Design a protein around this ligand. Structure first.
Ligand SMILES: NC(=O)C1=CN([C@@H]2O[C@H](COP(=O)(O)OP(=O)(O)OC[C@H]3O[C@@H](n4cnc5c(N)ncnc54)[C@H](OP(=O)(O)O)[C@@H]3O)[C@@H](O)[C@H]2O)C=CC1
Ligand code: SF4
Ligand SMILES: [Zn+2]
Lengths: 89, 377, 471, 182, 130, 114
């Protein structure tokens, strides 16, 4: 069965000869289908003008605490909390 | 230098001993819902061992075994002896397998052959293909290549099947450990329930072959058998070695039954125990035959004739064949165990007579080698 | 600013603190191993200003990851195929006891550098039962001068180093041989006008130092007192002369030591012994106080049929260099290259996992504490030897740590007065390793085992390449 | 993990049958034994009699279920006091060491087929007192638990939902049908 | 000839049997009287003014099921505080344990810590920057 | 190193033995009743034997006060067994039959882990 084959995004598969496989002979090995790494990758990097932007990730008090991210560096800048991505250029 | 099988530290022995310390043993226990399965599994759980407990009855029959281990230590796997696919699945990840399968009587879905030898070899072949390090089997101590009945003609099939099971299991598995007990006495046991149950008794006159005075029995206690199983499972150097599992002191069936009835308070004034000759009375056999023919499940009190032949058969040990002492297992004697064991069945506290002050049941007396040679002349 | 490796891993409230001592350098700095659920997450300095100074080098700080990779987790025995398959403790020790008994009483034991004194003493006692006194240490030392305690220590009281006034480092780079000692000197250089000369090759001590050359003839002329810095040494009130143990094992250096001790006679000021020896391994001083020989080649020259190796993963011994028939047993934790050349490989619990006694450079003995359960079948080193003895049939008397700690008390009461330092009084070209950080990071098996150190080596090499190419 | 079918899939599918065994039996004996199991399970399912052990805090919910808001005798459930006449035991509250032998004794004095519901966290895994010197960590270590009702306490709805889940387990139990194979 | 039945008895009364601790722990475990270590990246020091005792680590494996940190060793978390080591040794004896003190530290030697040295005409201690 | 302190019960070591042996009387005399009352495997001789060893459990008690308390515990446990407050599990507790005597010699310890 594929359930006990899938690689958890955390990065675990029971070895092919590992007795802890036995626990799934009769129950499914739940593995989630949304991997945050892929999803945030898909989200495009927002861009702004000001040297310093602010993110709360979510909205109002439904997101993470307000954080200010400077963009003067050439590259992207990833929000510490939500993983949103910023680029000033 | 004994090699190792796995190099994954998660799959490797650890802990301080107990319900949590994983012992590096993963076992399937075929026939776990039995007289000896309970004792084996409880011992294995005490070690902190992973169990797979295959079962063919309703899981409710086995749910009690869940109490024997910490979380995830016990899994129940529905199978059937007639489904090799299921057995393969049950043994793939296993490290050891124990074959506690086998009835005392015959069924409608199984004749002694198909359940007692043909099934066993299938299990062993599947186990061997699965690459299972250790395999264990049980075979009665009285096993003979050419059984001869003693009182009733068609009553030695169990013995024939037992020999067949041993040889073919050894054929299909290079080095399995075939432990060999006989007449294991314990709680919820064929042995003591049989000698206690009513149908076994006539009016007040237990019928015994040759008055039970031409029989030598050496029963052993169930836990000591179980404790042997685990100790020989932990050790792989026991592999490929039969073991005659017997108790400390042989006995004469007359000594036992009299002591039993003394323990049960069955002999004070009125209950009036007597011992017949089973040959004299021709009624006991009919009871067995009818009781077999009528009961759909296990016959009442295990009265089927095969049990009757078993009591008749003597217990022939042999030297060289290793023993429990070789397995490092101390053996609680009957004198320590049986009194408490039969305490539930004590009865007969008449108003007409005296009680309480009756002495503690004076124990029985063993039978020595020359004294045996007197018995058999 | 925060640890890149110990990043996001655990919170201080969750974690558990275990006092301990660093072992990767002979400073023996005090450590607080920050364990959480059988995982050594990080390392912190424990304030012991007599020794530790509350700082801590990068090696001790970051190499903790080395204790999670290349670990030995199963006894192994070399088959006719030769692959060293995994086996169990029964067969392993029984096989080892077989070889020892039938080898023919020609045995040696070479102690590595991460072996605690208990492992040394257990090793020695067993081999004295077997009748073999060939018990060497990897890092060789003075011939015929190993007897007076002050010949292999920092008699100058590492705390007292900061009090030093004129320091002479003969080819002994502290900045990569004892960084904690180095910063103590810099504190002197900043607060007491420490006159720091050098009689070795080029190095940088993070501060000015007078380089008088490299040739070993310079130490002799100075010891006679024929050079300007020698006059400075004379005029000082706390002179110190530091000689690196490598040089003392280089070659014909016992003469160098003898002259150095000769001059220290006059330099001695009351309550102050100038002579200084920056030990490198954390077990060398342990070896001296138990009475080993020095020099792995010494043990090879004995021509033993069997060999013992307390986690001795230095290349100083190679089976080619060994007798061909020499049976080889390795009793160490990390499966490093030196472990790779043994026919029997017994796992061992690393220093954080085992309770042992380490004599630091200056000489105080200090006790590690176990913070993490060892992996696999790994056991304590002094337990492996004890089991093997009783398997052979020459049992040692010490079945418990205290029994063993009393056996050490017999050998050296000074050596069990933990936390104290008994005084020893009187004491008795040049090219050196670890003259650059690139040399420094890769020193020991744990160091090579660690992933972060490997990243550090690459990062420094790349910045150098930038200097070449960014140009 | 699986998920319910969608509207059109339901449209294709037929009635889900009543006896969970189904109606695919081959021979007369099979078909007959299927019905007798169905009748037995129907009896044991419709009428179930808790023992009302109810040690603590959880017990209050064990009473609210008897209360008239989420009526339980509506389902055929009655609180018989005597364990000889009680068919099910809702162990609820903490199991202290003084109680452990008592629970064991009460359990096996009850005749089978006996099912145990471990209500509340205190019984499930020792709950909030798990690291205590006097509490049985869980009740799995004394008796064979059948259904776990998480909660502290479980809201009454949760408890009697679990009861229905026990009814489903009582519905699908195979005793005669599979004795035939035995 | 009495003061409400007062008696003369030795001050050091071992209480191992009355205590209730199993002899296994008493006979295989030590105690490590010390002062709790000062956290490296802190600066307040009002949690290392007490003398503390605890018991050596025994073992920790991981639960096969869920990969927790199982531990079948009771006195693993045990931790008690005292005002002075001699008090703790007195306590530890009365409960019949094996112990070995761990000397905390000598009194801090005064450091001059002058401000002017940052700016000196001759001494090396002139600060490079501010 | 002496302290002038209160008593509990016994003022001299001999009174302590007098109290201690009184307890031994109650326990010896009780054993048969518990064999009857408590349906447990144990027999009179074994119960008597354990009672002997369990006093030997602490032979080298010295302080008058400590031995007094040990007796105080015993008088309690006596009453809890005299009357049947205890349970068959509780009374058997003195044997510790659930766990096998763990290995003791160094190899068995070594080969079976810490
Ligand atoms: N006094 C004795 O019984 C003796 C014991 N032995 C041997 O030891 C073993 C254990 O003895 P004991 O427990 O008393 O015997 P039991 O009659 O109690 O058998 C116990 C187990 O055997 C299982 N069993 C029987 N037939 C089958 C089958 N076709 N398929 C699957 N399981 C089956 C049963 O499964 P389920 O209950 O679920 O139907 C049961 O769980 C036996 O095999 C016996 O040969 C040897 C000497 C004497
Ligand atoms: S689980 Fe919650 S509701 Fe139930 S007894 Fe415990 S604390 Fe009370
Ligand atoms: Zn954000």
């Amino acid at each position: 069965r594929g359930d006990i084959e899938k690689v958890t995004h955390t990065g675990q598969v029971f070895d092919k000869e590992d007795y802890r496989n036995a626990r799934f002979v009769n129950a499914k090995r739940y593995v989630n289908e949304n991997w945050g790494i892929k999803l945030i990758e898909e989200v495009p990097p927002k861009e702004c003008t000001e040297r310093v932007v602010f993110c709360d990730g979510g909205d109002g008090p439904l997101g993470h605490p307000k954080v200010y991210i400077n963009l003067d560096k050439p590259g992207n800048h990833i929000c510490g909390y939500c993983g949103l991505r910023f680029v000033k250029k | 230098p004994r090699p190792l099988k796995t190099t994954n530290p998660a799959a490797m022995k650890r802990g301080t001993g107990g319900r949590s310390s994983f012992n590096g043993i993963v076992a399937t226990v075929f026939g776990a819902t039995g007289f000896v399965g309970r004792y084996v599994c409880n011992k294995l759980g005490k070690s902190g061992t992973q169990m797979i407990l295959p079962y063919r009855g309703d899981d409710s029959d086995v749910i009690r075994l869940k109490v024997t281990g910490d979380l995830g230590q016990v899994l129940f796997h529905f199978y059937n002896l007639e489904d090799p696919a299921s057995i393969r699945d049950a043994v793939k990840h296993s490290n050891v397998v124990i074959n506690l399968v086998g009835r005392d009587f015959e069924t409608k879905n199984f004749k002694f052959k198909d359940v007692h030898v043909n099934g066993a070899e299938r299990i062993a072949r599947i186990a061997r293909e699965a690459g299972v390090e250790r395999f264990i089997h049980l075979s009665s101590l009285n096993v003979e290549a050419n059984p001869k009945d003693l009182y009733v003609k068609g009553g030695s099939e169990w013995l024939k099947s037992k020999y067949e099971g041993e040889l073919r299991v050894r054929d299909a598995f290079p080095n399995a450990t075939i432990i060999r007990p006989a007449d294991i006495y314990g709680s919820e046991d064929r042995f003591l329930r049989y000698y206690a149950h009513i149908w076994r008794r006539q009016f007040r006159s237990m019928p015994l072959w040759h008055k039970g005075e031409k029989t030598v029995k050496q029963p052993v206690y169930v836990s000591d058998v179980a404790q042997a199983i685990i100790n020989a499972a932990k050790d792989p150097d026991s592999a490929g070695r039969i073991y005659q599992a017997v108790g400390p002191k042989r006995y004469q069936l007359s000594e036992l039954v009299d002591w039993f009835h003394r323990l049960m308070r069955k002999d004070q004034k009125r209950w009036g125990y007597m011992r017949y000759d089973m040959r004299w009375d021709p009624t006991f056999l009919l009871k067995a035959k009818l009781n077999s023919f009528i009961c759909p499940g296990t016959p009442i009190g295990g009265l089927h004739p095969a049990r009757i032949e078993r009591e008749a058969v003597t217990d022939k040990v042999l030297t060289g064949v290793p023993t429990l002492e070789d397995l490092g297992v101390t053996l609680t004697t009957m004198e320590q165990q049986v009194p408490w064991e039969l305490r539930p069945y004590r009865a007969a506290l008449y108003y007409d007579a005296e009680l309480g002050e009756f002495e503690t049941p004076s124990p029985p007396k063993c039978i020595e080698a020359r004294d045996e040679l007197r018995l058999f002349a | 600013l925060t640890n890149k490796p110990y990043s996001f891993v655990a919170r201080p409230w969750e974690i558990r603190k275990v006092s301990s001592i660093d072992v990767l350098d002979a400073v023996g700095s005090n450590i607080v191993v920050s364990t959480r659920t059988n995982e050594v997450l990080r390392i912190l300095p424990r304030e012991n200003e007599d020794v530790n100074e509350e700082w801590l080098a990068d090696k001790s700080r970051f190499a903790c990851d080395g204790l999670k990779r290349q670990r030995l987790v199963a006894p192994m025995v070399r088959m006719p195929n030769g692959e060293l398959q995994a086996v169990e403790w029964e067969g392993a020790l029984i096989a080892v006891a077989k070889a020892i008994k039938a080898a023919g009483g020609q045995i040696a034991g070479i102690s590595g550098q991460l072996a605690d004194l208990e492992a040394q003493v257990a090793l020695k006692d067993l081999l004295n039962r077997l009748g073999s006194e060939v018990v060497a240490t990897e890092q060789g030392f003075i011939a015929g001068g190993t007897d007076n305690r002050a010949n292999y220590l920092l008699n100058s009281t590492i705390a007292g180093l900061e009090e030093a006034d004129a320091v002479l480092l003969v080819g002994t780079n502290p900045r990569y041989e004892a960084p904690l000692v180095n910063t103590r000197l810099r504190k002197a250089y900043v607060h007491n006008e420490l006159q720091i000369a050098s009689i070795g090759p080029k190095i940088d001590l993070s501060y000015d130092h007078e380089n008088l050359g490299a040739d070993a003839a310079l130490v002799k002329d100075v010891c006679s007192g024929a050079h300007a810095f020698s006059k400075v040494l004379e005029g000082a009130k706390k002179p110190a002369i530091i000689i690196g143990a490598d040089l003392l094992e280089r070659a014909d250096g016992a003469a160098i030591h003898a002259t150095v001790a000769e001059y220290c006679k006059k330099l001695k000021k009351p309550n102050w012994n100038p002579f200084n020896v920056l030990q490198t391994n954390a077990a060398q001083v342990g070896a001296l106080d138990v009475g080993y020989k020095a020099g792995a080649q010494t043990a090879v020259k004995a021509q033993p049929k069997v060999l013992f190796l307390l986690n001795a993963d230095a290349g100083k011994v190679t089976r080619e260099q060994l007798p061909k028939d020499c049976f080889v047993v390795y009793i160490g934790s990390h499966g490093d290259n030196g472990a790779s050349i043994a026919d029997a490989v017994l796992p061992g619990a690393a220093y954080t996992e085992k309770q042992g006694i380490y004599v630091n450079t200056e000489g105080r003995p200090q006790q590690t504490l176990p913070g993490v359960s060892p992996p696999g079948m790994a056991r304590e080193d002094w337990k492996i030897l004890r089991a093997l003895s009783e398997v052979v049939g020459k049992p040692l008397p010490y079945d418990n740590l205290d029994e063993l700690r009393n056996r050490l008390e017999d050998v050296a009461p000074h050596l069990t007065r933990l936390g104290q330092l008994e005084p020893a009084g009187d004491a008795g070209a040049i090219d050196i390793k670890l003259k650059e950080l690139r040399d420094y990071f890769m020193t020991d098996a744990i160091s090579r085992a660690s992933p972060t150190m490997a990243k550090c080596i690459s990062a420094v090499n790349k910045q150098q390449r930038e200097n070449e190419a960014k140009q | 993990q699986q998920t319910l079918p969608v509207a059109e899939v339901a449209q294709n599918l037929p009635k889900k049958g009543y006896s969970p065994f189904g109606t695919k039996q081959s021979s007369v004996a099979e078909w007959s034994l299927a019905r007798l199991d169905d009748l037995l399970n129907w009896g044991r399912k419709g009428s179930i009699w808790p023992l009302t052990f109810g040690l603590a805090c959880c017990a209050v919910e064990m009473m609210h279920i008897a209360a008239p808001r989420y009526d339980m005798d509506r389902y055929g459930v009655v609180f018989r006091a005597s364990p000889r006449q009680a068919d099910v035991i809702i162990v609820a509250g903490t199991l202290t060491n003084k109680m452990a032998p008592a629970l064991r004794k009460v359990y096996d004095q009850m005749p089978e087929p006996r099912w145990v519901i471990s209500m509340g966290s205190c019984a499930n895994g020792g709950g909030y007192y798990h690291y205590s010197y006097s509490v049985v960590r869980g009740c799995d270590r004394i008796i064979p638990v059948d259904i776990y009702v998480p909660g502290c306490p479980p809201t009454a709805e949760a408890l009697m939902y679990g009861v229905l889940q026990l009814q489903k387990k009582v519905k699908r139990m195979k005793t005669l049908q599979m004795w035939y194979r035995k | 000839n009495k003061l409400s039945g007062k008696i003369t008895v030795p001050t050091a009364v071992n209480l191992s049997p009355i205590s209730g601790v199993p002899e296994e722990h008493i006979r295989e475990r030590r105690v490590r009287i010390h002062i709790p270590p000062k956290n490296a990246m802190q600066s307040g020091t009002d949690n290392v003014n007490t003398w503390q005792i605890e018991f050596d680590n025994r073992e920790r494996w991981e639960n096969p099921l869920m990969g927790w940190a199982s531990s079948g060793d009771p006195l693993s978390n045990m931790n008690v505080q005292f005002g002075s080591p001699e008090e703790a040794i007195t306590f530890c004896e009365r409960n019949g344990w094996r112990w070995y003190v761990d000397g905390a530290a000598k009194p801090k030697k005064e450091r001059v810590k002058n401000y002017g040295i940052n700016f000196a005409w001759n001494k090396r201690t002139r600060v490079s920057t501010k | 190193a002496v302290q002038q302190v209160r008593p509990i019960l016994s003022v001299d070591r001999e009174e302590a033995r007098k109290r201690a042996l009184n307890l031994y009387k109650a326990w010896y005399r009780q054993i048969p009743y518990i064999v009857m009352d408590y349906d447990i495997p144990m027999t009179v001789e074994q119960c008597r034997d354990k009672l002997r060893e369990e006093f030997v459990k602490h032979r080298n008690v010295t302080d008058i006060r400590v031995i007094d308390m040990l007796v105080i515990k015993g008088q309690m446990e006596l009453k809890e067994s005299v009357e049947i407050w205890k349970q068959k599990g509780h009374i058997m507790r003195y044997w510790k039959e659930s766990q096998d005597p763990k290995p003791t010699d160094f190899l068995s310890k070594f080969i079976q882990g810490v």
